[PDB]
Amino acid sequence: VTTEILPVSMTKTSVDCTMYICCSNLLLQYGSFCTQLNRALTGIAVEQDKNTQEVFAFIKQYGAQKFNGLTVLPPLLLGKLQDVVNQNAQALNTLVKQLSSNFGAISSVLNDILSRLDPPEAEVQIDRLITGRLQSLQTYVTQQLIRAAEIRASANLAATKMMSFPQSAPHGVVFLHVT
C-alpha cells in the first residue's frame, strides 16, 4: 500500500475594488485595471471551485475594511498540501505587507495625502500610490495564475485517478493504493 497526496484546492481570494482603491472619483479613474485584476481573481476562485467539484464529485485574522478590501471567499463545498497552504499564506502576507508601504509617497494613507499637500501635486502622488497598490495586486494575480495552473494540472491528474481508496484532506485528497 502506497500513499500519495494530491492538492485539489486553493483559498478563494476575491478583491472588491470600491474600498481597495478608495470619494468615488478615484474609482472612475482606476477602475479598469482593478476590474481586470478582480475578474482574474474571481476566475482563479471559480477555477478552484470547479477543481474541487470535479475531483470530489492573513487567513487566520480574517476568519473587510480593516484589510483594505482584500477578502477571503469561503468555498461552497502530508507535505504537498503544506506547501500549498504555506506559499498561499506567503503570497497573501507579502501582499498585505506591501500595501503597508508608502511606495515613495509622503504617506501610505489617503487621509493625510489630501491634508497637508496641494491638490495639483496630490493627483500625481495619489496616482503613484494607488497604481502601485494595483501593481502589487498584479504581481499577486500573476503568482496566483501560475500556481492555479499548477494545482489545475494536479486537479485533472487527481480527477483522472478518480485498488485505490480515497480520503479527503485540507485543500486536497489522499490516495491509498493497495497493490
Partner 1 sequence: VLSQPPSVSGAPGQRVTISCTGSSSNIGAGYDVHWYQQLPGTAPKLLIYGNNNRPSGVPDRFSGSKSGTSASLAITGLQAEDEADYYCQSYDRSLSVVFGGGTKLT
Partner 2 sequence: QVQLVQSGAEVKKPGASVKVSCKASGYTFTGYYIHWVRQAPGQGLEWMGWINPNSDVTNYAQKFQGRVTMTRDTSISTAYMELSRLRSDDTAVYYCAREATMIRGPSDFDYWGQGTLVTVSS
Residues that bind partner 2 (CB under 8 A): 29-30, 32-33, 36, 98, 101-104, 123-124, 127-128, 131-132, 134-136, 138-139
- String marking each residue 140-159 x if it binds partner 1 according to CB under 8 A: --------------------
Cα(172)–Cα(127) distance, rounded to whole angstroms? 41
Among 128, 147, 152, 161, binds partner 1 (CB under 8 A): 128
Cα(47)–Cα(92) distance, rounded to whole angstroms? 18
Crossing angle between the packed helical segments 119-161 and 26-56, to the nearest 10 degrees: 10
Q: How many residues bind partner 1 (CB under 8 A)?
A: 7
How far is CA 9 from its chain centroid? 13
- Residue 161 within binding range of partner 1, rule CB under 8 A: no
- String marking each residue 68-107 x if it binds partner 1 according to CB under 8 A: ------------------------------------xxx-
Cα(45)–Cα(179) distance, rounded to whole angstroms? 36
Binding partner selected for residue 46 from partner 2, partner 1, none, CB under the kind-specific 5 to 8 Å limit: none
CA torsion sign for 131, 116, 25, 12 is positive
Among 9, 48, 52, 125, binds partner 1 (CB under 8 A): 125
Tell me the closest approach of the beta carbon of residue 31 to partner 2, in angstroms: 9
Please answer whether residues 8 and 56 qualify as being in contact, where contact means their C-beta atoms are separated by less than 8 angstroms: yes
Judged by beta carbon, residue 32 or residue 101, the one nearer partner 1 is 101
CA torsion sign for 89, 34, 18, 44 is negative
Binding site for partner 1 (CB under 8 A): 104-106, 121, 124-125, 128
